[PDB]
Amino acid sequence: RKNIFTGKRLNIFDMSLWDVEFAKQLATVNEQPLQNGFEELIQWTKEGKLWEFPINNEAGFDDDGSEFHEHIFLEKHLESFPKQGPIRHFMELVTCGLSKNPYLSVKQKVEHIEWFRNYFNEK
Amino acid sequence: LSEYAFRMSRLSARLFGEVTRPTNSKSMKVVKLFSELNHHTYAELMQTLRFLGLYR
Amino acid sequence: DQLLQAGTTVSLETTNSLLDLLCYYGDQEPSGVTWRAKNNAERIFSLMPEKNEHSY
Amino acid sequence: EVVIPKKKTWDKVAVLQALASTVNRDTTAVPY
Amino acid sequence: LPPRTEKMAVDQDWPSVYPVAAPFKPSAVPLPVRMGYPVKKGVPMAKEGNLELLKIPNFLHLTPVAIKKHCEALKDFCTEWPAALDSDEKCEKHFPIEIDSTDYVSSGPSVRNPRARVVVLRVKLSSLNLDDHAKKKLIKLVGERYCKTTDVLTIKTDRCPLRRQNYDYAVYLLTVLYHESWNTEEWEKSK
Amino acid sequence: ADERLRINSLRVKRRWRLSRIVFRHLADHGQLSGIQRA
Amino acid sequence: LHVDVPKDLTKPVVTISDEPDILYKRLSVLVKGHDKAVLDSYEYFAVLAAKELGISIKVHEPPRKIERFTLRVQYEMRTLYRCLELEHLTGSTADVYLEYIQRNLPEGVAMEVTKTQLEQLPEHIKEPIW
Numbered sequence: 001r002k003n004i005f006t007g008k009r010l011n012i013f014d015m016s017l018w019d020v021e022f023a024k025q026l027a028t029v030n031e032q033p034l035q036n037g038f039e040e041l042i043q044w045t046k047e048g049k050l051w052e053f054p055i056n057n058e059a060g061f062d063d064d065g066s067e068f069h070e071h072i073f074l075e076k077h078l079e080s081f082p083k084q085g086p087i088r089h090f091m092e093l094v095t096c097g098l099s100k101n102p103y104l105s106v107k108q109k110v111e112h113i114e115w116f117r118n119y120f121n122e123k
Numbered sequence: 124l125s126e127y128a129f130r131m132s133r134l135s136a137r138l139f140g141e142v143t144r145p146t147n148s149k150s151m152k153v154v155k156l157f158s159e160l161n162h163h164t165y166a167e168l169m170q171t172l173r174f175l176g177l178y179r
Numbered sequence: 180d181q182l183l184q185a186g187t188t189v190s191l192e193t194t195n196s197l198l199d200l201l202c203y204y205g206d207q208e209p210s211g212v213t214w215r216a217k218n219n220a221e222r223i224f225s226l227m228p229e230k231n232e233h234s235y
Numbered sequence: 236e237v238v239i240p241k242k243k244t245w246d247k248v249a250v251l252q253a254l255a256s257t258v259n260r261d262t263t264a265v266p267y
Numbered sequence: 268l269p270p271r272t273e274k275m276a277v278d279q280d281w282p283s284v285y286p287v288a289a290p291f292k293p294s295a296v297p298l299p300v301r302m303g304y305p306v307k308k309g310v311p312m313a314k315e316g317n318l319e320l321l322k323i324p325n326f327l328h329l330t331p332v333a334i335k336k337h338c339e340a341l342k343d344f345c346t347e348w349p350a351a352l353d354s355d356e357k358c359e360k361h362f363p364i365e366i367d368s369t370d371y372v373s374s375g376p377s378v379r380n381p382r383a384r385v386v387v388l389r390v391k392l393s394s395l396n397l398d399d400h401a402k403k404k405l406i407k408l409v410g411e412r413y414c415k416t417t418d419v420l421t422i423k424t425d426r427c428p429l430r431r432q433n434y435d436y437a438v439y440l441l442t443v444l445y446h447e448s449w450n451t452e453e454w455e456k457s458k
Numbered sequence: 459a460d461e462r463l464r465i466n467s468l469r470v471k472r473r474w475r476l477s478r479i480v481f482r483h484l485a486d487h488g489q490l491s492g493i494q495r496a
Numbered sequence: 497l498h499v500d501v502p503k504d505l506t507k508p509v510v511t512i513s514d515e516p517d518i519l520y521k522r523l524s525v526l527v528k529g530h531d532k533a534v535l536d537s538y539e540y541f542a543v544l545a546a547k548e549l550g551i552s553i554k555v556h557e558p559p560r561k562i563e564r565f566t567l568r569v570q571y572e573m574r575t576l577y578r579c580l581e582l583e584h585l586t587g588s589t590a591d592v593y594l595e596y597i598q599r600n601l602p603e604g605v606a607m608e609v610t611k612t613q614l615e616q617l618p619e620h621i622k623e624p625i626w
Contacts, residue, residue, distance in 0.1 A: 021203065156463065250508070324602040369610045449625075
């Protein structure tokens with residue numbers, strides 16, 4: 001007349017690929033077919049096939065964690081160029097043009113500046 | 124044009140990042156330049172599906 | 180076997196991974212297999228120099 | 236006094252889970 | 268085989284039949300709906316096999332009962348507007364700056380839109396602590412961005428690629444404009 | 459693209475990407491979204 | 497389901513964070529379509545959802561646009577509009593409402609959501625630098 005969780009016990013205690021496959025076959029015990037459309041949408045969202053809502057038009061894009069000062073102030077890369085000549089004028093204009101380019105990353109702008117540096121160095 | 128308007132305008136240009144030196148307009152073009160930025164393969168897919176017995 | 184022939188010393192963790200794979204699949208490629216004496220896993224286990232808890 | 240409410244954050248699929256729990260199984264249809 | 272509309276009761280739970288946006292299924296929709304320009308001494312085409320009914324973006328998955336039963340469950344995700352802000356008069360008092368940003372929903376594989384980076388800051392100059400000289404300088408400096416009728420300064424930033432960067436740029440532009448308006452040069456003496 | 463631009467700086471229904479005949483064929487069938495002939 | 501019903505359901509986890517919520521003065525949802533009936537049905541759906549979620553909504557119809565082009569054979573494209581201004585809604589309510597109505601966006605209809613967040617002046621601008 002007593003519940004099965006009371007009685008004699010052992011009393012002996014007191015308080016790689018193997019793991020990967022173990023977890024994979026744990027995944028199976030709760031592997032049932034989709035039961036309706038909402039579950040299908042949830043499954044695809046978890047898989048990442050579906051867009052996130054509300055739509056963020058810049059989702060998955062962070063521009064390498066760049067800051068605005070790295071895009072708008074690009075004149076620090078013109079230090080190795082002439083400081084008061086006509087090349088200074090042309091490069092100031094070029095960096096003004098690059099700083100107003102929203103389609104380019106900072107890396108592309110700096111490599112443009114470096115190409116100009118190299119071309120003038122050869123000449 | 125009062126020279127006061129002139130230097131106040133070129134200060135505005137420095138603050139907002141426009142070209143401070145007015146370089147006329149013909150040489151202003153490169154600012155615009157730098158401000159901006161396969162039916163073949165699909166057919167051998169169709170051929171491959173044919174070979175595998177899944178097209179036509 | 181190629182690395183052994185080349186005389187290159189294989190690290191302990193790597194050979195442990197080898198024995199993991201061989202034991203879990205029992206010398207067969209991924210799709211019961213009965214344990215065969217003198218199969219590859221036993222040869223790897225015998226060939227390794229210092230045997231730790233993980234290999235056993 | 237402007238008491239700005241605290242932001243509520245929810246999981247990626249919370250809205251879909253709510254909408255799914257909102258509808259029950261169809262008795263006259265085969266599985267989806 | 269027979270359609271399953273024959274097995275549907277007249278008091279069924281319709282939302283469960285169409286949980287989500289699904290196309291018109293004549294074997295699942297229990298309506299004798301017809302559509303099509305009739306022929307002479309003819310009738311509009313029946314639903315079974317009608318491509319025109321299959322072309323409609325049907326709202327069967329969104330019925331008033333379904334909408335209510337959905338938005339009743341979605342209430343748990345909402346917060347309450349601060350009751351102190353009863354009208355726009357107090358909104359323009361306690362929160363002077365207005366930041367306008369846009370998102371675009373098209374259909375396709377790419378979620379990107381070039382127009383989502385634009386940010387528009389709007390602030391009334393009367394909310395900023397500027398003296399006579401400061402306000403004169405700021406107005407002359409901004410130019411057309413200031414509208415005299417509304418007393419509003421509108422700074423639109425789109426230079427940076429992202430939207431947070433443009434918002435930061437707009438904030439920095441406002442910061443400089445204020446500080447450089449509150450400054451008098453040796454040049455500024457002889458107006 | 460970048461290389462050619464740098465030196466330069468110092469100095470039919472293409473709208474839909476269809477053949478002009480084909481665009482008529484598609485649009486007559488109603489295939490194009492919103493292209494109603496008037 | 498007359499007898500067999502789920503006994504309990506997993507309500508999604510919505511945790512009340514400590515960070516203060518965003519406040520939106522206005523939220524203009526401009527929906528564009530080739531069909532006026534779809535836009536009317538979507539207007540009914542969105543308005544009903546807005547009334548039930550407590551959001552204040554006002555609807556109007558911006559003017560229709562026409563793109564006419566000749567290849568003689570002449571073709572035309574219609575763009576009809578419906579603009580839904582929500583007012584005085586917080587960040588979470590706006591986010592959930594937008595998720596709902598954008599997931600339920602009908603075929604061939606695009607959306608342009610303009611959000612006007614309310615913010616305070618930066619502390620740097622409260623007084624001039626000395």
